[PDB]
């Protein structure tokens, strides 16, 4: 066997810089649209606590012209009801609130209605983006059983806005044994990231017959961004010129490779299954498998990229990708992802692996 | 001379002492006062030190609540400066002077 060439992987990184050269106009367009929309949310009295969580989140690094802009909303303390032992889908019940914040006034019964929230959220967006002058922002289809709220800013700038609840409470009990950055960063950094707030995004339970259920799954984007800014066991990783690692490098390599496979083999009905969040969680488990900055060195660029490919293929074959935050939650379940889809992705990544990756040029 | 305006250092002291929680009254003169009044009542009473600490907690929290009500009285009278008539008003409403 042989590792992929580190010069070739740095050439792919240079091609990734060439992919992300187009920030400076799309960032201005989305900043103008976010500015106008945030200065029209303040006109509404029933949503006076909404906000922009500050995470520019390139989930799609192979094409940075599409944005997924997340909004935060400061909520009261929430009693959480787990749905159907699914270990990730929870019900939002505002436990007790004497101030009577208007989200509770919008609520139905005791469970916060996610469909009602996303419906009136779409209603306010459709109503307010019409008012935008000299910036053609139109309401794209909400289909696909996802957060959606697709907004196109006038030339291929597809912004998928998803408002997210942010509870500053304590973490749920299923998130206890997770965040295994103890031997990777420290137990103290683990406990300090545990002190940071968690997030709530909707998805109805898509298990066969479950339709428009009011479930709420946890998001972990900000902790993952903060550990991407501090990723070495040594705290000056990719900061001084003796500790240039390949964690950011191999992670961008894996995510670009997955998104180029999803762009090429994009025939309908198979793509919806895979995301680079899965690759990022598998990469965090590779960081658990490879904890040392000596085991992420620049001479180990091809070796760590190979280890990431083989561990993602391990998660595809053994059908087990635990969340790095929830140990009791496999992201590669057989009902969210089809088994022929798992075989196809395993076959394509093995196909690209065993022929020295001819996609890299 | 880098002299502030007469309200700015007052505002940072308000931020500091609402941020702080420690005892503002010095412990030993408070202990002398407590021992003085108790010696006036019953001679040669030894004191638990935690009892003196509890007395100081009660006195400081009582005076802080009194100063909140005094500040509300002084702001209420279209003023900004407290006066002892504000304190007499606040205790008369609480029912200590009447």
């Amino acid at each position: 066997d042989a590792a992929p060439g580190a010069s070739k992987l740095r050439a792919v990184l240079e091609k990734l810089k060439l992919s992300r050269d187009d920030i400076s106009t799309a960032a201005g367009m989305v900043k103008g649209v976010v500015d106008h929309l945030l200065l029209r949310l303040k006109c509404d009295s029933a949503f006076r606590g909404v906000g922009l969580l500050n995470t520019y989140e390139h989930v799609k690094i192979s094409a940075p012209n599409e944005f997924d802009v997340m909004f935060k909303l400061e909520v009261p303390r929430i009693q959480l009801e787990e749905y159907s032992n699914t270990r990730a889908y929870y019900f939002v019940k505002f436990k007790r609130n004497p101030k009577e914040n208007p989200l509770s006034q919008f609520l139905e019964g005791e469970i916060l209605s996610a469909s009602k929230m996303l419906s009136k959220f779409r209603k306010i967006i459709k109503e307010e983006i019409n008012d935008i002058k000299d910036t053609d922002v139109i309401m794209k289809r909400k289909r696909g059983g996802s957060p959606a709220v697709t907004l196109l800013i006038s030339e291929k700038i597809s912004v998928d806005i998803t408002l997210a609840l942010e509870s500053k409470s304590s973490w749920p009990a299923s998130t206890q044994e997770g965040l295994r950055i103890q031997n990777w960063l420290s137990a103290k950094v683990r406990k300090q990231l545990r002190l940071k707030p968690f997030y709530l995004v909707p998805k109805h339970a898509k298990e066969g017959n479950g339709f428009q259920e009011e479930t709420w799954r946890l998001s972990f984007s900000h902790i993952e961004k903060e550990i991407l800014n501090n990723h070495g066991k040594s705290k000056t990783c990719c900061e001084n010129k003796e500790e240039k690692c390949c964690r950011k490098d191999c992670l961008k390599l894996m995510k670009y490779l997955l998104e180029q496979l999803k762009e090429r083999f994009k025939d309908k009905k198979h793509l919806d299954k895979f995301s680079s969040y899965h690759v990022k969680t598998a990469f965090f488990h590779v960081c658990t498998q490879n904890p040392q900055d000596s085991q992420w060195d620049r001479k180990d660029l091809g070796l760590c990229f190979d280890n990431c490919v083989t561990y993602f293929l391990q998660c595809l074959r053994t059908e087990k990708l635990e969340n790095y935050f929830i140990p009791e939650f496999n992201l590669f379940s057989s009902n969210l992802i089809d088994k022929r889809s798992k075989e196809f992705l395993t076959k394509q990544i093995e196909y690209e692996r065993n022929n020295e990756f001819p996609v890299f040029d | 001379p880098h002299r502030y305006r007469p309200g700015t250092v007052a505002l940072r002291e308000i931020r500091r002492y609402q941020k702080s929680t420690e005892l503002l009254i010095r412990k030993l003169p408070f202990q002398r006062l407590v021992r003085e009044i108790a010696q006036d009542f019953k001679t040669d009473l030894r004191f638990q030190s935690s009892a003196v600490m509890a007395l100081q907690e009660a006195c400081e929290a009582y005076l802080v609540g009194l100063f909140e009500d005094t500040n509300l009285c002084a702001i209420h009278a279209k003023r900004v400066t407290i006066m002892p008539k504000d304190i007499q008003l606040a205790r008369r409403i609480r029912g200590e002077r009447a």
């Binding site: 406990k191 707030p197 | 931020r15 907690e57």
Partner: protein, 102 residues
């Protein structure tokens, strides 16, 4: 135990002993210390919940009486409950009047 039998955390047996010792009445019903330990458990849970949330808001992982003071005095209904009560080592709320500001 009766705490395990009621699924509660507070010791129902100790509450039953204290109701017998405290001379509140001669006879003490069986569901009374169960109900009382439940009410104590709910109050302690909500107050420690607010205190730990304030401690996370001040990034402290150890609960000190400052956070208890802030938690009780920031809930207006708990403030209505404990308006007379002084917490020791508590301080007060951060509360600046709007006429003072420039």
């Amino acid at each position: 135990t009766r705490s395990s039998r009621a699924g509660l955390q507070f010791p129902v047996g100790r509450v039953h002993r204290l109701l017998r010792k405290g001379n509140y009445s001669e006879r003490v019903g069986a569901g009374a210390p169960v109900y009382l330990a439940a009410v104590l458990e709910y109050l302690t849970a909500e107050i420690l919940e607010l205190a730990g949330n304030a401690a996370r808001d001040n990034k402290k992982t150890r609960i000190i009486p400052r956070h208890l003071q802030l938690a009780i005095r920031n809930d207006e209904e708990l403030n209505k409950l404990l308006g007379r009560v002084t917490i020791a080592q508590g301080g007060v709320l951060p509360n600046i009047q709007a006429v003072l500001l420039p």
